Amino acid sequence: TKTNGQHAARKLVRLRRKNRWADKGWKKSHTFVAQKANPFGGSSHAKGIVLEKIGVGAKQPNSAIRKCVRVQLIKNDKKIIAFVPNDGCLHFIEENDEVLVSGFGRSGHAVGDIPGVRFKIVKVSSVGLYALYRQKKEKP
Amino acid sequence: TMMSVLANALRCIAGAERRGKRQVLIRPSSKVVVKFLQVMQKHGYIGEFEIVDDHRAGKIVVNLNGRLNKCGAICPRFDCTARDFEKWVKNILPSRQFGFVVLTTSLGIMDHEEARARNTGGKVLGFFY
Amino acid sequence: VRMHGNGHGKAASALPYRRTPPTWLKSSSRDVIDAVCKLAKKGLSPSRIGMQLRDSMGIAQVKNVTGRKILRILKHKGMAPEIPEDLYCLIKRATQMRKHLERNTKDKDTKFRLILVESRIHRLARYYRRVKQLPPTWKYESSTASAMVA
RNA sequence: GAUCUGGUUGAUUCUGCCAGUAGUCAUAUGCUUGUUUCAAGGACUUAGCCAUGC
RNA sequence: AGCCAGUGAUGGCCGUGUAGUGGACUGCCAUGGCGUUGACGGGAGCGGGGGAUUAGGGUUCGAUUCCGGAGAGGGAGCCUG
RNA sequence: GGACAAGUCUGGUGCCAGCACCCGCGGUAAUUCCAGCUCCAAAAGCGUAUAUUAAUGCUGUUGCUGUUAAAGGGUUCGUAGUUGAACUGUGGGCCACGUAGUGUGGUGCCGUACCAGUCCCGUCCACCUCGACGUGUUUUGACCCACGCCCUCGUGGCC
RNA sequence: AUUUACUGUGACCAAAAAGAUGCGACCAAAGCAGUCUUGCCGACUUGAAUUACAAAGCAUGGGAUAACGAAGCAUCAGCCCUGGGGUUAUGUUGGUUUUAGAAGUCCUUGGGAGAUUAUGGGGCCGCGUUGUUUCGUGUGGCGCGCCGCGGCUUCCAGGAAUGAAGGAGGGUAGUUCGGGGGAGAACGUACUGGUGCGUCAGAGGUGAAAUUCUUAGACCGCACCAAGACGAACUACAGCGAAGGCAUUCUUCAAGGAUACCUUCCUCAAUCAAGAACCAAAGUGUGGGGAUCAAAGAUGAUUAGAGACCAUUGUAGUCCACACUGCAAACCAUGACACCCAUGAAUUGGGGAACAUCAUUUUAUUUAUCAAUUUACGUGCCUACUCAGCACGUUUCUUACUUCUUCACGCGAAAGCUUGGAGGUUACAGUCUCAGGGGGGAGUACGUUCGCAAGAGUGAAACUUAAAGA
RNA sequence: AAAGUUCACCGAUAUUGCUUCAAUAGAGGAAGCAAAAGUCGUAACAAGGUAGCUGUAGGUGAACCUGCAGCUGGAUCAUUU
RNA sequence: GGAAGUCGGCAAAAUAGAUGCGUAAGUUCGCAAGAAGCAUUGGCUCUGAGGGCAAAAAUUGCCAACUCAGAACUGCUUACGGCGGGGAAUCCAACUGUAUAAUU
Numbered sequence A: 001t002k003t004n005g006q007h008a009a010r011k012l013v014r015l016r017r018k019n020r021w022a023d024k025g026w027k028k029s030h031t032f033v034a035q036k037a038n039p040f041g042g043s044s045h046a047k048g049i050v051l052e053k054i055g056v057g058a059k060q061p062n063s064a065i066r067k068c069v070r071v072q073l074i075k076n077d078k079k080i081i082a083f084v085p086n087d088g089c090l091h092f093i094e095e096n097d098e099v100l101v102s103g104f105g106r107s108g109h110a111v112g113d114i115p116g117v118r119f120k121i122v123k124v125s126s127v128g129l130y131a132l133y134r135q136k137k138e139k140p
Numbered sequence B: 001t002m003m004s005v006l007a008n009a010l011r012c013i014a015g016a017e018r019r020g021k022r023q024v025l026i027r028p029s030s031k032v033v034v035k036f037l038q039v040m041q042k043h044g045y046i047g048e049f050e051i052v053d054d055h056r057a058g059k060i061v062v063n064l065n066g067r068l069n070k071c072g073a074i075c076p077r078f079d080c081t082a083r084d085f086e087k088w089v090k091n092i093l094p095s096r097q098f099g100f101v102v103l104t105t106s107l108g109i110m111d112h113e114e115a116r117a118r119n120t121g122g123k124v125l126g127f128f129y
Numbered sequence C: 001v002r003m004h005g006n007g008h009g010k011a012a013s014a015l016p017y018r019r020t021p022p023t024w025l026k027s028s029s030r031d032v033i034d035a036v037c038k039l040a041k042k043g044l045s046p047s048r049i050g051m052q053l054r055d056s057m058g059i060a061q062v063k064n065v066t067g068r069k070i071l072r073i074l075k076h077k078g079m080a081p082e083i084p085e086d087l088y089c090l091i092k093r094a095t096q097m098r099k100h101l102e103r104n105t106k107d108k109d110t111k112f113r114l115i116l117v118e119s120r121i122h123r124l125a126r127y128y129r130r131v132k133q134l135p136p137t138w139k140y141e142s143s144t145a146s147a148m149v150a
Numbered sequence D: 001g002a003u004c005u006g007g008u009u010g011a012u013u014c015u016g017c018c019a020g021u022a023g024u025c026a027u028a029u030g031c032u033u034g035u036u037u038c039a040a041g042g043a044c045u046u047a048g049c050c051a052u053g054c
Numbered sequence E: 001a002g003c004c005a006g007u008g009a010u011g012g013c014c015g016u017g018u019a020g021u022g023g024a025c026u027g028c029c030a031u032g033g034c035g036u037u038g039a040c041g042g043g044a045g046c047g048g049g050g051g052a053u054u055a056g057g058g059u060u061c062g063a064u065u066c067c068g069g070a071g072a073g074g075g076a077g078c079c080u081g
Numbered sequence F: 001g002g003a004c005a006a007g008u009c010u011g012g013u014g015c016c017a018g019c020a021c022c023c024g025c026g027g028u029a030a031u032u033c034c035a036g037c038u039c040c041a042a043a044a045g046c047g048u049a050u051a052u053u054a055a056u057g058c059u060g061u062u063g064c065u066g067u068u069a070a071a072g073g074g075u076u077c078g079u080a081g082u083u084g085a086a087c088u089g090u091g092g093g094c095c096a097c098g099u100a101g102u103g104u105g106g107u108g109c110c111g112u113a114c115c116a117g118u119c120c121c122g123u124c125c126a127c128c129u130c131g132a133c134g135u136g137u138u139u140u141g142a143c144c145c146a147c148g149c150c151c152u153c154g155u156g157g158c159c
Numbered sequence G: 001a002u003u004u005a006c007u008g009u010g011a012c013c014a015a016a017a018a019g020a021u022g023c024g025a026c027c028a029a030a031g032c033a034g035u036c037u038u039g040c041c042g043a044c045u046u047g048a049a050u051u052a053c054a055a056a057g058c059a060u061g062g063g064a065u066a067a068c069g070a071a072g073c074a075u076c077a078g079c080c081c082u083g084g085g086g087u088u089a090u091g092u093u094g095g096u097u098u099u100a101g102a103a104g105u106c107c108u109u110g111g112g113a114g115a116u117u118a119u120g121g122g123g124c125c126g127c128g129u130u131g132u133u134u135c136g137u138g139u140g141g142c143g144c145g146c147c148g149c150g151g152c153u154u155c156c157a158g159g160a161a162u163g164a165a166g167g168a169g170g171g172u173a174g175u176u177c178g179g180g181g182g183a184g185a186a187c188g189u190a191c192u193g194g195u196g197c198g199u200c201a202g203a204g205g206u207g208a209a210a211u212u213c214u215u216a217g218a219c220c221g222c223a224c225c226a227a228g229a230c231g232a233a234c235u236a237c238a239g240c241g242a243a244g245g246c247a248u249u250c251u252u253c254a255a256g257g258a259u260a261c262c263u264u265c266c267u268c269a270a271u272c273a274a275g276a277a278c279c280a281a282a283g284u285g286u287g288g289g290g291a292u293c294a295a296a297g298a299u300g301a302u303u304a305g306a307g308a309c310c311a312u313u314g315u316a317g318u319c320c321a322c323a324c325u326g327c328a329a330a331c332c333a334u335g336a337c338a339c340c341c342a343u344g345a346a347u348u349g350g351g352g353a354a355c356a357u358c359a360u361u362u363u364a365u366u367u368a369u370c371a372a373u374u375u376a377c378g379u380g381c382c383u384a385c386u387c388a389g390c391a392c393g394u395u396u397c398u399u400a401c402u403u404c405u406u407c408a409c410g411c412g413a414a415a416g417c418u419u420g421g422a423g424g425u426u427a428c429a430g431u432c433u434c435a436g437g438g439g440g441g442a443g444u445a446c447g448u449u450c451g452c453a454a455g456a457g458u459g460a461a462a463c464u465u466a467a468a469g470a
Numbered sequence H: 001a002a003a004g005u006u007c008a009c010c011g012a013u014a015u016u017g018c019u020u021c022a023a024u025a026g027a028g029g030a031a032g033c034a035a036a037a038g039u040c041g042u043a044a045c046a047a048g049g050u051a052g053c054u055g056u057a058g059g060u061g062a063a064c065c066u067g068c069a070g071c072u073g074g075a076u077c078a079u080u081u
Numbered sequence I: 001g002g003a004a005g006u007c008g009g010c011a012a013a014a015u016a017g018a019u020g021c022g023u024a025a026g027u028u029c030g031c032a033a034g035a036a037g038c039a040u041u042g043g044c045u046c047u048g049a050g051g052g053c054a055a056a057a058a059u060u061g062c063c064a065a066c067u068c069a070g071a072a073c074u075g076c077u078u079a080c081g082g083c084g085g086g087g088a089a090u091c092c093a094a095c096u097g098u099a100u101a102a103u104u
């Protein structure tokens, strides 16, 4: 119901400071804890090495194999799972290749029916995965 | 306990006009209450009123003519610079064509239209329309 | 509402609008002052002096005739009580309750009421120290207060 | 521009979030690129290490 | 949730040192000084003029052209002026 | 396909391959996948990722919610803090003249109504003719606004 | 002695950037330039003028506020005049000495003031105990008038202060009101166990049984004894308490609210981090006590099974004293204080009217706009005294818990709320305080304070989800 | 007037020891979240077949059962006038 | 060199007084504790503080005792006696005490 006092500025300032920690959006941007757990060091992209090609089953209502990959990041030696989009496009990737990884669209949240994947492959050997798919370039 | 005589009086008048009464009794009275009522009466919103003496804070009986839609006090009494009249009119009034904001200035208690003519600011007391 | 309860009591007296004394009184201002000083000699509080005048000698208010209040008259004559009357009556009540609590240690209801009365005393003493009716550095203690009281 | 829309039910009216939408002399990457004017350009990480010339 | 005093902490007296004032520093004396109107400790961070978003109130950015401060691998000392 | 502008077109695949920010599509007639043809947006530009502002009255001073959706302390006392009743008081004259509400009195006063008289019917329900009061005028006078002047601008005290 | 906040007007405030005047760089993003009378030039060319929190500084205004002071006998001296008393300047500098002022300090005349009456106390005592004013010349109303005296003396300031909030506190009264609280003494049946008599074959328990007691006399009947708990019916949309809670009688102790009042006082107040006290049942420690019921345990059933529901038992507990604990669907799932608010029946306490007891305005012939008096009314019991008493009937008032199924606006997503709000809120501002921000992980982990323990308070994240919910 | 001697002061650097912060290996013991339409039962939703739920204490393969006080969010707004 | 000796650090070595600063886990809140650990210590010449008794009294005079705290100068061959080594854990017994005179 709040004060409304005309000399109660201190009470109002203290009230807003305490109650601003109760929303996840404000807390996440001010806490430095999600940044440390983020495999990317607060960046939009990262480079890594391919360790293995794996198949991830889709969630229950759907039924498919999603053709993901396991990548170790160069900057801090963390392991993640990245999705490889588009038809085929797994034949362009080999073990020990160098890839560029970006996020999905939901800022660290898993998307679609893929269980726990929040990254996707963007470049391989510094050519461009979608360009290879449309045959505009050849893999070096 | 009661902390504002002016706020108490304006709530009694606005409540009575909502119910369509002809007269209302206000208790207790004060100098600021009488001045506020004289501004409303001058513009033709209430009519005749009478003060009864009891050797304490008095009592007021007000006659209502049915022209008053709403009146109310503003707490706390914010300061209003002479260039800030448009901001208050936009916020608490139905339009820019009628209605008044009542201020207390060093020249006395007056509506915002008279204060603009005399070029004085002050502290906002209330409103009516 | 009451200071220390939930009761909403309205019982009180209503003074009249007309302040002039009636024409049948026929009692001078000097006579009223003499009657007030006699009763204080007998040892009555200002509240009891006013009731005695009202009930027997037909004086409705001691301010409407002689133009002075009862406690002001006593102060001028030098017969005012050492501590304010309302403060004294509260200290006396607390003393009686403590005496009862010495023998009865299971009276949790009386212990609760003692807390309220002592809280009222400390609030009253704070006001009287500010308006300089009590000397500064005046304190109420349960051990000492048994004295200086009825 | 003082503007909102999709998802909880066999249907209804809510609370509430998730998703959509517009900008950024705001960075990076992909595809594409005929003419002209004006412009920032190893800050982010490593106040890390330096051939040569000035 | 308490901080500061052997070895300066707050103030006083006579001095020394400085271009000059000063617990800046030597000797002696008193017990002071700060704090829920958030001291002490911790985290991020060069400050400002300003930029972005514009019903209004606000939220957020400012290493970077102008002004001020600091540094020249780290950290200490110094001559000439 | 919807949000969201634009096909109930033609082949292939058959819960596979894949699409899909969200809802969802795909097991033999797929408006959603892979393609062809048409069409849409904005265009020398257009997608994607991360951060931030608006959308957000989902941080609410302006401006949120608290019976049952998340949310009133088990109850009293109580310090710092915030908030706290009324009063000392805004004057009066003189003209002028368009207002200007009211009372008090002037002046005449068709018609209507009322009271008091006279006669007359009735005994349960009706009428005639006069000596005044009203109603309606017209000024005075006290409230009101506009415009000038004056005031030792309460009383008192000088002149 | 008067001061701040607020408000009007001006001072002091780098540029760039931002708002703005002017100029056809071909337009524009720009820039501060440029134009033409055809110039040995001119326009005395231009390049205006703004905003910039908060603090500071100058001079207006005094309505709302705020900082001071005071708490009213801790006070109050009344003004002007005339007659008395007891540093200059002497030509300059340096020394001695004076005459006067002024000041204070006591007497006295002149005058006018006063915001509160020289007339207040004694004694020395002695004496005796028809003129205005209404109202119709006149009438009628008119209002005023038609231990007492006495001279003296001494002492004396004792009346000048807003008012008493349908704000708080205190006082007196009905020895009012009530399952309110603490102490003693007793009372009542019942469950259980004994004792004494009588009788004789079963009693108990269940849906049906069995475990169990019984000719060594159970169950049943009468009388009595012992110990512990509990106070039925009356008992209610009733009372009291801050909540948790409180039910036999009598005797005691201190309190509490409401009502009544021409008592007193004069802002003493509301809400509250920190802090304090109390707080159901279970549970804990040390002594008592131990009738009933009964976690754990035992036995009999039932069942596919039955560590359960049913039956017979049975320990801790259940009760008291003194210490702890502070966890409830601790609920009205509804924070405290204050204002306004329509209707009809009821109810709990106090008071007024009534009953009973005592005592013995004009007017007004010709009117009316918000009336000048709706105030009315009886019953039963009652000395061959907790009594001028006790109930009932009728009309008002203050306080409290409520109802409408013959309760209005208004509000709400709805169910519903409604003088007691969940109303008076997008027509959004009376005051203070505590919580919430999608569902889970979770009131969990870690750290710290409190506790004998059981626990209590404070209190995250990584991850995971598109709904959960009303 | 150079080298050089002694003392005071400023003080880099190294070693040792405390304090503080940030990341990190671990046999074993647990908790949470998912998947697979695995095994045992049936606690809740109807009086869910013993009404349900809160606090507390004990017990048991699992859901749960039992004792004491409370609530209706009940399966009763209700019966000596 | 530093336990490689040995069943076993047995025996020996080793710590050490006083003063200033500082001190962990655990805990029945009393302890643990001298926990752990760092620094100073001579000689000589000086300075300050800590009192009684008298007097016509913040004054003057007379006088006793041995502690504590500082300064300058100067020195070391680390130099009598006496005087705890410390820490991290497991098993048993709560603790002080008694007890096989002559192997426990």
Ligand SMILES: [K+]
Pocket (backbone or CB within 6 Å): none
């Ligand atoms: K000095």
Ligand SMILES: [K+]
Pocket (backbone or CB within 6 Å): E081
């Ligand atoms: K030079």
Ligand SMILES: [K+]
Pocket (backbone or CB within 6 Å): none
């Ligand atoms: K097909």
Ligand SMILES: [K+]
Pocket (backbone or CB within 6 Å): F064, F065
């Ligand atoms: K909300």
Ligand SMILES: [K+]
Pocket (backbone or CB within 6 Å): none
């Ligand atoms: K017990």
Ligand SMILES: [K+]
Pocket (backbone or CB within 6 Å): none
């Ligand atoms: K049982």
Ligand SMILES: [K+]
Pocket (backbone or CB within 6 Å): none
């Ligand atoms: K609780």
Ligand SMILES: [K+]
Pocket (backbone or CB within 6 Å): G348, G349
């Ligand atoms: K009652």
Ligand SMILES: [K+]
Pocket (backbone or CB within 6 Å): none
């Ligand atoms: K159950």
Ligand SMILES: [K+]
Pocket (backbone or CB within 6 Å): H048
């Ligand atoms: K079931």
Ligand SMILES: [K+]
Pocket (backbone or CB within 6 Å): none
């Ligand atoms: K239970």
Ligand SMILES: [K+]
Pocket (backbone or CB within 6 Å): none
């Ligand atoms: K130890």
Ligand SMILES: [K+]
Pocket (backbone or CB within 6 Å): I096
């Ligand atoms: K011993």
Ligand SMILES: [Mg+2]
Pocket (backbone or CB within 6 Å): C003
């Ligand atoms: Mg209170």
Ligand SMILES: [Mg+2]
Pocket (backbone or CB within 6 Å): D010
């Ligand atoms: Mg259906």
Ligand SMILES: [Mg+2]
Pocket (backbone or CB within 6 Å): none
């Ligand atoms: Mg930095």
